[PDB]
Amino acid sequence: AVPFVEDWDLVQTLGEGAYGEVQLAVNRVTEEAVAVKIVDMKRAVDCPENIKKEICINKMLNHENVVKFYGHRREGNIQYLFLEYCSGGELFDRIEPDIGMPEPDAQRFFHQLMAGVVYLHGIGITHRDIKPENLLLDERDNLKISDFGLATVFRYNNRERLLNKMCGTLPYVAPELLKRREFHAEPVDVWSCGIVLTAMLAGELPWDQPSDSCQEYSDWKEKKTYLNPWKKIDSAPLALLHKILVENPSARITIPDIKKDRWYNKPLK
Numbered sequence: 001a002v003p004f005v006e007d008w009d010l011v012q013t014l015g016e017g018a019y020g021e022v023q024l025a026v027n028r029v030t031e032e033a034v035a036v037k038i039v040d041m042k043r044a045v046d047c048p049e050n051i052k053k054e055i056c057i058n059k060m061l062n063h064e065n066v067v068k069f070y071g072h073r074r075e076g077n078i079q080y081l082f083l084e085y086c087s088g089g090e091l092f093d094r095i096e097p098d099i100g101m102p103e104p105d106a107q108r109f110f111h112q113l114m115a116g117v118v119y120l121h122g123i124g125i126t127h128r129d130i131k132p133e134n135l136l137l138d139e140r141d142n143l144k145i146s147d148f149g150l151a152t153v154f155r156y157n158n159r160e161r162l163l164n165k166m167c168g169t170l171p172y173v174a175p176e177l178l179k180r181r182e183f184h185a186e187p188v189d190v191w192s193c194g195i196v197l198t199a200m201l202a203g204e205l206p207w208d209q210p211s212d213s214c215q216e217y218s219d220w221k222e223k224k225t226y227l228n229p230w231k232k233i234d235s236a237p238l239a240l241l242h243k244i245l246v247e248n249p250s251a252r253i254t255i256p257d258i259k260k261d262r263w264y265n266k267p268l269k
């Protein structure tokens with residue numbers, strides 16, 4: 001009964017912010033490394049959809065492109081979260097401002113991004129907050145999706161539940177979420193992946209939000225992909241983006257079709 005195996009040393013802090021902080025934990029004996037999120041409490045009108053939800057959903061998640069959840073521990077006010085350690089870091093920092101990154105890597109990250117989403121959707125769960133800072137990388141640069149504090153089930157018992165609660169991050173949020181009462185969950189994550197796509201192949205975000213009151217979003221819908229933000233994107237990938245950032249969520253392309261895309265299956269490039 002190897003002693004001391006349950007004690008973890010909080011070697012350092014990996015990130016700081018709203019929630020509180022994420023610390024790197026190292027086992028006292030084995031020396032394995034994990035991520036520990038520290039919080040306190042939040043909201044109440046829908047407690048099940050709070051720190052408790054981030055736990056319930058994580059308890060269902062299991063895929064090589066989704067941050068592994070090890071467990072939780074309460075302490076009156078101190079709530080510890082044991083997540084997978086990703087020495088790689090946030091995809092965000094691998095994106096040169098104004099430039100982005102090499103098309104190859106972008107495609108590689110996008111492929112893995114699709115696998116996680118396919119999986120999550122496969123099991124009826126939507127992220128609702130997909131963005132470069134919620135995409136971690138491990139030692140081998142494998143893409144891992146994290147932060148399911150906004151994730152919710154949209155299919156239970158083979159029945160789809162439409163959404164109406166606005167959640168996410170404005171720049172990454174689909175247009176039907178600001179113009180409609182209710183909408184389908186799945187198309188909302190595709191739009192976000194698309195915005196992530198454009199961030200990786202251009203180093204910048206198109207609009208502050210998908211509203212007509214927003215300049216660049218109007219130019220986009222007008223095909224002015226010249227000089228503008230898409231000027232830095234090659235035509236193969238840009239074609240795919242013409243298929244993703246389609247206003248009408250029902251016209252918008254689906255994951256299964258994205259995997260059939262020309263640039264998606266194009267070698268290296």
Ligand SMILES: COc1ccc(Cl)cc1NC(=O)Nc1cncc(O[C@@H](C)CN(C)C)n1
Binds near residue numbers: 037067083134135136
């Ligand atoms: C703060 O996150 C960082 C920063 C730098 C490095 Cl090298 C690794 C991690 N995270 C992990 O290893 N693991 C992890 C797994 N899930 C969530 C989370 O923290 C989030 C709450 C912070 N951002 C929004 C990802 N961290």
